[PDB]
Curated annotation (Swiss-Prot):
This is MHC class I polypeptide-related sequence A. It comes from Homo sapiens. It comes from the Eukaryota. Widely expressed with the exception of the central nervous system where it is absent. Expressed predominantly in gastric epithelium and also in monocytes, keratinocytes, endothelial cells, fibroblasts and in the outer layer of Hassal's corpuscles within the medulla of normal thymus. In skin, expressed mainly in the keratin layers, basal cells, ducts and follicles. Also expressed in many, but not all, epithelial tumors of lung, breast, kidney, ovary, prostate and colon. In thyomas, overexpressed in cortical and medullar epithelial cells. Unlike classical MHC class I molecules, does not form a heterodimer with beta-2-microglobulin. Binds as a monomer to a KLRK1/NKG2D homodimer. KLRK1 forms a complex with HCST/DAP10 in which KLRK1 binds MICA while HCST acts as an adapter molecule which enables signal transduction. Interacts with PDIA6 on the surface of tumor cells, leading to disulfide bond reduction which is required for release of MICA from tumor cells. (Microbial infection) Interacts with human cytomegalovirus/HHV-5 protein UL142. Widely expressed membrane-bound protein which acts as a ligand to stimulate an activating receptor KLRK1/NKG2D, expressed on the surface of essentially all human natural killer (NK), gammadelta T and CD8 alphabeta T-cells. Up-regulated in stressed conditions, such as viral and bacterial infections or DNA damage response, serves as signal of cellular stress, and engagement of KLRK1/NKG2D by MICA triggers NK-cells resulting in a range of immune effector functions, such as cytotoxicity and cytokine production. It is linked to Anti-MICA antibodies and ligand shedding are involved in the progression of monoclonal gammopathy of undetermined significance (MGUS)to multiple myeloma. Disulfide bonds join 36-41, 85-153. Belongs to the MHC class I family. MIC subfamily.
Length: 164
């Protein structure tokens, strides 16, 4: 009876140039459920029109987020966003958002409380502040946006469980 939905979207840059498209891994109760990219979604009369629309839009957002990182244009870099929601046995919820730069976690938000966790190193702190500025100023994200992110995730989790 405890359930979880986990989205993992990755975008890449080469010599500072952000690559076309994206790659999303979705997990339902810990089991790999979908691989999605620019072209289509495929599981692991099959139609994924909701996921293709929503994940493409997120892909677009994260690509602009990576472009706004004032780091370096030498080699491969990756920005990776994880979105998680859980329904616990006692009907309570957890939900969070996590950013990874070149495999290292550097920023998290708890979507139940809207509090952010900043990293230890100054290098990671620079990345966190860059991203948080982009989200607040350029993307114009507000409390309602993050409340809505929680709700959307939970509603999707409930939708998938309702079918199978
Ligand atoms: C989010 O999903 C991505 C994939 O879409 C996960 O990355 C993939 O998983 C592992 C670990 O990062 C990689 O495989 C392992 O590392 C090397 C690659 O250098 C590989 O040669 C080994 O065979 C080993 O199994 C895999 O290559 C990697 N794929 C990509 C495209 O990066 C990632 O772990 C997920 N992140 C989170 C935070 O859940």
């Amino acid at each position: 009876e405890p359930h979880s939905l986990r989205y993992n979207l990755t975008v890449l840059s080469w010599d500072g140039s952000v690559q076309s498209g994206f790659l999303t891994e979705v997990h339902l109760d810990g089991q790999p459920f979908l691989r999605c990219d620019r072209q289509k979604c495929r599981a692991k009369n099959k139609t994924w029109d909701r996921e293709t629309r929503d994940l493409t839009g997120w892909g677009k957002d994260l690509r602009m987020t990576l472009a706004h990182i004032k780091d370096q244009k030498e080699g491969l870099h990756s920005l990776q966003e994880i979105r998680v929601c859980e329904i616990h046995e006692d009907n309570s919820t957890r939900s969070s958002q996590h950013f990874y730069y070149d495999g290292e976690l550097f920023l998290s938000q708890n979507l139940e409380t809207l509090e952010w966790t900043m990293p230890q190193s100054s290098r990671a702190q620079t990345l966190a502040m860059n991203v948080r500025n982009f989200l607040k100023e350029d993307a114009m994200e507000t409390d309602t946006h993050y409340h809505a992110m929680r709700a959307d995730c939970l509603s999707e989790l409930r939708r998938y469980l309702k079918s199978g």
